[PDB]
Amino acid sequence: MDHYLDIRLRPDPEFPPAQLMSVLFGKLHQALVAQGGDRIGVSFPDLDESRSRLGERLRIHASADDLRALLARPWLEGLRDHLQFGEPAVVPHPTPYRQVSRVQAKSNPERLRRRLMRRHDLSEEEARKRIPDTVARALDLPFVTLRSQSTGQHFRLFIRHGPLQVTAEEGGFTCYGLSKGGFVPWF
Template sequence: MNHYLDLHLLPDPEFSSAQLMSALFAKLHRALVAQPALHIGISLPQARAGQPPADQQPGTQPYLGQHLRLHGQADALAALMALPWLSGMRDHVNPGPIAPAPANAPHRLVRRVQADSNPERLRRRLCKRHTLSEEEARQRIPNRAARHLDLPYVQLRSQSTGQHFLLFIDQGDNLPEPRPGGFNRYGLSQGGSVPWF
């Protein structure tokens, strides 16, 4: 993870930055699935959880930003950019050069967080797994048990089921030292950290 490449979204009157970021993320995912030897991590330097920035309306989704940073070895980043994965997005994205990451940058874990936001689904699952009655499941999982996340997310469509889902991203706190480890096909941590700058 000693190099990086920045992808900046360009303003578009027809699409919001959240829509464009979701489309860019989906294309990156497909490229990483097609090239499993590439070890690429991501970060969203402008993303903010919770309160949106001043230029967004209150009550809108947490802010993703307009900047996707790819982390990896220089050869892995070059191999990714040699693929046609950005086709259809070239008018919406300004890719920067591959450059060395700052040597003294802190590291963070950028990982997926899954929300258990549907108590009915959790109850059905509990009934099925533990042969409980509906009332027993309702007592164990009350409506207030739903977990709502206030994290930035991208909206994606599952290639296998066709269903839309939200992929919540937590960028963690600075770590005292880098963590070795892998990354999934979304570029999210499976133990590995990325430089944060």
């Protein structure tokens, strides 16, 4: 956790950086699924909260063995033309800590209507009256649009950075690099 690897987005004359970010995030998700482990933290060094911008720089946080296992994986092939890869340097000691969390939303009422059909055996009009169409959740959070190998539907994954703390305790990490209770340093 003491080390970090920094990825900068090369500007692209054919693609805006958002879909490049989505592609690389899917590649690192596949790399972490293949590699395993629960000590991989993500960071957005230039996250703009004014317009919910993802940013043009990426920071991944891991240990030395985890970082060399990640860079040894051949997922990096086919993406070197658009990114920078620095060195697994030690993170600065006086750094505030913040958490990253995947915030999902119930933006589609018909999914929950189908769910309550499978839970309470209600009819179509019962679910229509019980759940209006205005219950959609709109999030002013940065997001990435990806499709999964298990389910081919394209899903949107919101990423939100927590408040700055002064210390961090041990926690877990998901397959996306998002923390289920962990923290990443800010610098």
